PDB file of C-alpha atoms (C1' of nucleotides) in Angstrom:
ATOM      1  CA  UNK A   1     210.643 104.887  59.497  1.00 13.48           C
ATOM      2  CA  UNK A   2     211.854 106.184  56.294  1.00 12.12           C
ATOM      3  CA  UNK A   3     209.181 108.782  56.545  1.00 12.95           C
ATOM      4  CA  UNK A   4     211.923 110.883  58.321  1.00 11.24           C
ATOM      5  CA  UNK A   5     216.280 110.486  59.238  1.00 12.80           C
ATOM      6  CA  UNK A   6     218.012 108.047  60.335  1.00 13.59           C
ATOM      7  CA  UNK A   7     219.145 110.615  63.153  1.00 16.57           C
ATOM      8  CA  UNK A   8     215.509 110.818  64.182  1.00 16.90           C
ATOM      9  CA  UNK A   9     215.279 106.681  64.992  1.00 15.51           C
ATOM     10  CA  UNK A  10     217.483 107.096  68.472  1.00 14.12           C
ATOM     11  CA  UNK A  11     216.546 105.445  71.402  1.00 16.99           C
ATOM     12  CA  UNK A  12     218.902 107.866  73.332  1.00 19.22           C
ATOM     13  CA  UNK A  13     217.245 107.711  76.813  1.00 17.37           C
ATOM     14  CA  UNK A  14     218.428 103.947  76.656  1.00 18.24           C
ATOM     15  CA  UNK A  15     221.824 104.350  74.727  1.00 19.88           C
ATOM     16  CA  UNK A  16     220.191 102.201  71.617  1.00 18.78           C
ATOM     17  CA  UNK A  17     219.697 103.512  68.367  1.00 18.47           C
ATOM     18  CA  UNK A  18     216.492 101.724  67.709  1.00 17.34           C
ATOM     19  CA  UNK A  19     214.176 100.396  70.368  1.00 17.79           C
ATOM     20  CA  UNK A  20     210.488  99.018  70.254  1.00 18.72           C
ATOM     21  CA  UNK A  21     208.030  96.595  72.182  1.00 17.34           C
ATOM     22  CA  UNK A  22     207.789  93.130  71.049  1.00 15.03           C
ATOM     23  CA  UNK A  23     206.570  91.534  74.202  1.00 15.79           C
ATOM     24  CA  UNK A  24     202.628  92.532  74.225  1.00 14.42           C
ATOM     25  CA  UNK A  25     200.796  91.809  70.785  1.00 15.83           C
ATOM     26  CA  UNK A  26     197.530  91.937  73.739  1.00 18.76           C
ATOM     27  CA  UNK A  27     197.384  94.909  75.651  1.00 17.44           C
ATOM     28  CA  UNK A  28     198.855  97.074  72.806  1.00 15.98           C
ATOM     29  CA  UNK A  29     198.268  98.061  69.302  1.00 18.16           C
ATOM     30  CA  UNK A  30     201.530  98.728  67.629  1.00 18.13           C
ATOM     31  CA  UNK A  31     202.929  94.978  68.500  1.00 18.36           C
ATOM     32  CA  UNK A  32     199.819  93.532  66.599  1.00 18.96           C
ATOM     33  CA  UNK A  33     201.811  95.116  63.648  1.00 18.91           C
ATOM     34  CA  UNK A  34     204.685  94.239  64.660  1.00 20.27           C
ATOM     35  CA  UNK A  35     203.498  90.576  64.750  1.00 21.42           C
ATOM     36  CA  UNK A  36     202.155  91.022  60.964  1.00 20.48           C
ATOM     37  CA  UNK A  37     205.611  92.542  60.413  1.00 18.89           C
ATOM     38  CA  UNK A  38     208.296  90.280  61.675  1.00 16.45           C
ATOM     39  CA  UNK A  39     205.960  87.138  60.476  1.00 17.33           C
ATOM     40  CA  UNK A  40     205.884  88.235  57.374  1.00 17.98           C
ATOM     41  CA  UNK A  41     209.958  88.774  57.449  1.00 19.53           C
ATOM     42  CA  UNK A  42     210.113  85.527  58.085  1.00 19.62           C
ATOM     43  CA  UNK A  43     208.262  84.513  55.657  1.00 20.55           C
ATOM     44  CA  UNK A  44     209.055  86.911  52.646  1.00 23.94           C
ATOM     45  CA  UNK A  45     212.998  85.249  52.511  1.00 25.28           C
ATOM     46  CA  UNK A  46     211.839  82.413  50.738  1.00 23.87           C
ATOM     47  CA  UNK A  47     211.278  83.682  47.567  1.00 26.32           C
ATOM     48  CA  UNK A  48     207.384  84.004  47.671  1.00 27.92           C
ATOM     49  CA  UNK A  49     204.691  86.633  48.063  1.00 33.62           C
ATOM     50  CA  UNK A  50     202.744  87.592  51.342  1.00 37.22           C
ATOM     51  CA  UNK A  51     199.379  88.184  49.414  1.00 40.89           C
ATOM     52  CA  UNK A  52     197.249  91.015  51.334  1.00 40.94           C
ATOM     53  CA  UNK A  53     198.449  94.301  51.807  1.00 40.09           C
ATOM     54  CA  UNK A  54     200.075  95.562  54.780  1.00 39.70           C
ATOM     55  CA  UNK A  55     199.801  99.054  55.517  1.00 37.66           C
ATOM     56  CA  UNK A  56     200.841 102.152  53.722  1.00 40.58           C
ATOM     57  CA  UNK A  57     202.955 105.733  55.076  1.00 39.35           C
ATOM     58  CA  UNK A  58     199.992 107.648  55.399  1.00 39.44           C
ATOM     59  CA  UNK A  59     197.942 105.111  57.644  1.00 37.79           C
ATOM     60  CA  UNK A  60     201.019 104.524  59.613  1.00 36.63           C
ATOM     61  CA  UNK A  61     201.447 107.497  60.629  1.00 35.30           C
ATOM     62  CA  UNK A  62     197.724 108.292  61.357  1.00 35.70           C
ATOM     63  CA  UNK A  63     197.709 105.263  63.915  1.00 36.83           C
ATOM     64  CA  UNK A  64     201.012 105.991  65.326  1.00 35.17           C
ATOM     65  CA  UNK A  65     199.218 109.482  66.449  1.00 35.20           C
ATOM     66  CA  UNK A  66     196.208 107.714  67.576  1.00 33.19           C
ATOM     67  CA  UNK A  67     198.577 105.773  68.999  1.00 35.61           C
ATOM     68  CA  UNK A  68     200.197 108.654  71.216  1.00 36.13           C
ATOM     69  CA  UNK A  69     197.034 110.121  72.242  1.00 35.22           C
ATOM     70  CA  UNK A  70     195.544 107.043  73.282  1.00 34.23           C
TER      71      UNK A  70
ATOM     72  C1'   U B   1      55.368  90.027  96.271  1.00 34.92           C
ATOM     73  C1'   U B   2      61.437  93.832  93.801  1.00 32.76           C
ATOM     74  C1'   U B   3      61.492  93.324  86.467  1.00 34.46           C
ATOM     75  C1'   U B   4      64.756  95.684  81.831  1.00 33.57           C
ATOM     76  C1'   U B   5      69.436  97.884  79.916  1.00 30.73           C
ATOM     77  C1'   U B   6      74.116 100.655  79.982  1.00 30.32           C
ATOM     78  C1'   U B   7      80.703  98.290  73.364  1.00 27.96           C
ATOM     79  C1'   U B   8      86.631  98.049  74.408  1.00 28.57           C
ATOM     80  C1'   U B   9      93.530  96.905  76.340  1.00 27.89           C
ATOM     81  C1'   U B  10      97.396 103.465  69.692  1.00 28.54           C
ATOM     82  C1'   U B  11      97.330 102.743  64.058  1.00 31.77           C
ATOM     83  C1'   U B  12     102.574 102.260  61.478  1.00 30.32           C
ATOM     84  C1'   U B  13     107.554 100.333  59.770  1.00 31.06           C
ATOM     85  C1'   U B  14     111.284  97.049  54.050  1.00 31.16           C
ATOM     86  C1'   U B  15     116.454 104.498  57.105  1.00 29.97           C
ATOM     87  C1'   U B  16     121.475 107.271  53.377  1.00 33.71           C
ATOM     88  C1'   U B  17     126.277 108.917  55.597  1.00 33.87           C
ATOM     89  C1'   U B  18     132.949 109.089  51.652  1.00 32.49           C
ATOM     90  C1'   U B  19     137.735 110.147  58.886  1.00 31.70           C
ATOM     91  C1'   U B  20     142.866 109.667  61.953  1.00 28.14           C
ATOM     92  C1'   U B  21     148.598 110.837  67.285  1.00 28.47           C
ATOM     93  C1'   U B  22     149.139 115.912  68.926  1.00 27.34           C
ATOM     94  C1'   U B  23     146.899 120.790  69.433  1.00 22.56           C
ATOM     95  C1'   U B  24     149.209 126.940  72.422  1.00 19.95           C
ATOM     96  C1'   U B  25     154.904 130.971  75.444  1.00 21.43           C
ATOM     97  C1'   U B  26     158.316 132.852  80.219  1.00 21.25           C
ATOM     98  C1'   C B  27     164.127 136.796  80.252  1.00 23.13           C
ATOM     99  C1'   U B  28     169.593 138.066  80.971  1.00 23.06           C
ATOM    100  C1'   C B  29     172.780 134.813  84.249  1.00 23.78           C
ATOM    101  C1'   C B  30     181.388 136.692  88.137  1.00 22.90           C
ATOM    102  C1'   U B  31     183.275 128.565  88.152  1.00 21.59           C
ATOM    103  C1'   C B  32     188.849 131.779  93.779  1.00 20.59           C
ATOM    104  C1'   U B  33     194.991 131.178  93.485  1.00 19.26           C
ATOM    105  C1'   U B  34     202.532 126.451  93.577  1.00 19.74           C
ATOM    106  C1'   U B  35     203.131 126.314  88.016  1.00 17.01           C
ATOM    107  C1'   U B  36     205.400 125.697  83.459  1.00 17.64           C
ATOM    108  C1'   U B  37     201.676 121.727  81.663  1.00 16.28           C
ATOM    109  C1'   U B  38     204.423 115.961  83.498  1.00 14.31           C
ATOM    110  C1'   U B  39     206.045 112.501  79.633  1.00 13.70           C
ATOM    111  C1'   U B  40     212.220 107.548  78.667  1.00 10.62           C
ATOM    112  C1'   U B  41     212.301 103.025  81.477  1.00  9.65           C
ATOM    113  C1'   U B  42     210.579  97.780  83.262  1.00  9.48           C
ATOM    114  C1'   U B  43     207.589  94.232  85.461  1.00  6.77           C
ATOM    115  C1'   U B  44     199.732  93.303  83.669  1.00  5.23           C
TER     116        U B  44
END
RNA sequence: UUUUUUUUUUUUUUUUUUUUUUUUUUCUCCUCUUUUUUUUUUUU
């Protein structure tokens, strides 16, 4: 994400601007976070506090290049 | 009518000890050929 431009978050083979899996948290990695992610979306507009850490930039990117090579 | 004598199976038992798997060679060595390397996408 914000670890680069907007301009770099295309999805230009498909016409979108932003595109990702959802539909696999089981045979994939990045839709396990995704699951963390959009759960705790939906629960962070209440007015609360998701206690536990998530992730930071540094280990994002670091398994998002795993990621690729694997 | 044929008496008397010529030994036998070595003696001994009431001695201390503080180590340790194995063990010891063999040299440098020409990998042949459409490629840059493909890559989104979806159904597990």
């Amino acid at each position: 994400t914000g670890s680069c431009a907007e301009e770099e978050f295309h999805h230009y083979g498909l016409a979108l601007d932003k595109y990702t899996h959802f539909t696999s948290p089981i045979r994939r990695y990045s839709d396990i976070v995704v699951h963390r992610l959009l759960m705790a979306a939906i629960s962070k507009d209440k007015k609360m506090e998701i206690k536990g850490n998530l992730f930071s930039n540094k280990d994002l990117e670091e398994l998002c290049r795993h990621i690729n090579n694997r």
